[PDB]
RNA sequence: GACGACGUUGAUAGGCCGGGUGUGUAAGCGCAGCGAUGCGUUGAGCUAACCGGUACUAAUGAACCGUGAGGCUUAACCUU
RNA sequence: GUAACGGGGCUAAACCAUGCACCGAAGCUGCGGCAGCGACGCUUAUGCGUUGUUGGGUAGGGGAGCGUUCUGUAAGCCUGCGAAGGUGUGCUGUGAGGCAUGCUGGAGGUAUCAGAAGUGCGAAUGCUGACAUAAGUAACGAUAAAGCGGGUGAAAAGCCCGCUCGCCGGAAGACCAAGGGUUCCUGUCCAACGUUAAUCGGGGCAGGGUGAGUCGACCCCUAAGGCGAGGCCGAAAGGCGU
RNA sequence: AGGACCGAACCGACUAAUGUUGAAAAAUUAGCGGAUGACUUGUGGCUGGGGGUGAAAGGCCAAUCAAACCGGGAGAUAGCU
RNA sequence: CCCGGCGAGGGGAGUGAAAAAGAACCUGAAACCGUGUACGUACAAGCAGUGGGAGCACGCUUAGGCGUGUGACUGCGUACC
RNA sequence: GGUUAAGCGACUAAGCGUACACGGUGGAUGCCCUGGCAGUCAGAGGCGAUGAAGGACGUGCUAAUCUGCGAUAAGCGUCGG
């Protein structure tokens, strides 16, 4: 139910070797704005693969 | 639950008021004991 | 040359913040920014935000290029943390610590 | 987490078409009846996860990671 | 779980007998060093020429010392050409410790010989404060329920507006007392408070707001009961009561 | 007519589950008992600690009761830790 | 002056002997939490040290084979009160 | 030199450890005293129906608090300094 010694920083670390972040690597880009964004996801202005999607 | 606690500024006033208190000897040496120490609030009056 | 900027008494715990600091430690600027920009995360909002005024005042104070710039070194400090009183059942009482942290930034032409 | 399939040179999912299944003769109209209801249209209408099909929708071009012939010694072979 | 040589393994690496070797302790010896107690040369205002011997240690006894604060020595001495303190380094003593010095620090410190002690902390489920741990884990307080559009804004699942949905409806509605005491309205702000965000709020700041011959209190009257002129009683205090 | 019957409010608290660092220092949910009475409730009042009150359990007397709380005697005493 | 939400919080500038004295302010210890560098660590079992000790890094050095940090491997070793 | 085979074999650090450097947290240490403690020598040893002690509400160019004052309200008169 609870510890019987207190744990080390080593161990916490340890424990946190796996809580790391990733940060996406790249950025979609079209060819009619030039603007980058996420991939299968919309950009600021609302360009998309040269068709004007959602623009207001 | 009911509480212990249930306000009633007149039984407050008649129970530990100040005329409560100069009515007994020994409630005239609560009031100088809180003189002498120096109480803000010698009562519960007000 | 190289240039700072910290962000002192931040309303995060270090730990949440550091995750954050991982990420860009060693990139270039605008590397970083986009990073923190697409990264869903609250520390990200802040990182951004000191991370952007070390560009301003690399680009007002000593007038370097943006492109040339890149982070050098970033870390998170413990700040101090809120004392607080969380009721708790059978009349008992816990504090709760709401953590601060310091945030620093540095950039450099190197 | 992982594992498997697919990503337009495409049936991966949804939708759609058809079918099946289940429920059990929809609504509307008409007829009969004072009426409740019944009959006809009508095994009708609806039908989820199923089956068989279909690019209508979404699965974007890219980018990222990963490199550039892979140590030393000895023996037998190339040169039995 | 082999589990009745510690194990591997051994037919000697077992047992008996004999003998010569070797390993083997903080024991003994050797080399160097410290200290204690003894006898010695009356040595010498006592250290040794030397000399032997001893030196595990709880309770406990005895002996000798370090350092800390304060007083005198001291209107002296050190000190802004950098004190105390803090942090390192180097040297040094048998030890408690000491000396010097770099950095920090920015104004006090103090020899020597004496004197006095709130004089030395790891423990007392010690006291106070700070900070860890579990852990970014549990939880975010009724399973009445939310969805979308627009607006505002640095930012909107939570605010405003609107269309729907859902919940209470002998209440989860409305008006009061008690109690609280500005929580009411407007504007403005979002650090903290709100178990999230917050432009919102019973939050912060400022301003404004409570109008009575008829409501209520006060007032007149008394109930229980309280106080109680005199009075009765009681060591005093005081009690009962007209 | 009824310390009558069924049953809401109201007053209670028999069972079970949950909760047990709880939403709650005794509650919640589903059932349960009484419900014109020895009923229940508001306001105020009286009873004070070896005393009160008690359809009596050593029950209650401000989350404290085989002798309340506060202060004092008081640094009680502790042949024990 | 600049980033930021006409924010918070910072970076400059300036004041000052000093801003690493900036009001969360003299000095600023420790626990605790971090960044960077060196070494070690993913076939190795236990009070985590001690004795021995390679290699690596760094500093010396009139090469002087020493010092500092790390500590592969190895003998012994079950905290304190 | 080439191929094959056998043997040996560094470079990895998700993270961790030790050391050093630079920091954060925190407020110890030292330094400081318009505060306390204990006394000595002097005083005064009472205030109050001529309304006390102690308070409430008020009082400013004043929003709050403290101090002072009391509708003559941080003050009025007079005598001196």
Redesign the pocket.
Known sequence: ???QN???????????????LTAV???????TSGE??????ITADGY??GRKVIA? | ????????????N??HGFRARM????GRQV??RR?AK?????TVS? | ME??????????????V?LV??LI??KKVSQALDILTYTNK?AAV?VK??L??????????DGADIDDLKVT????????????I???????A?R?????????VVVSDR
């Open positions: 139910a609870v510890q207190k744990p080390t920083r080593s161990k916490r670390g340890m424990r946190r070797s796996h809580d790391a690597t790249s950025l979609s880009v079209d060819k980058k964004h996420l991939r299968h996801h998309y693969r207001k | 639950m009911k509480r212990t606690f249930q306000p009633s500024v007149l039984k407050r008649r129970s009515a007994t000897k020994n009031l100088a003189r120096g109480r803000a609030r010698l007000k | 240039t700072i900027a910290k962000h002192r008494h931040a309303r995060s715990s270090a730990q949440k550091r600091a991982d430690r060693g609250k802040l935000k000191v952007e005024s070390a560009i301003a005042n690399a680009e007002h104070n070194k970033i870390f998170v400090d413990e700040g101090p943390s809120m004392k607080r969380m009721p708790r059942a059978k009349g008992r816990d709760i610590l709401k953590r601060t942290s310091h945030i620093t």
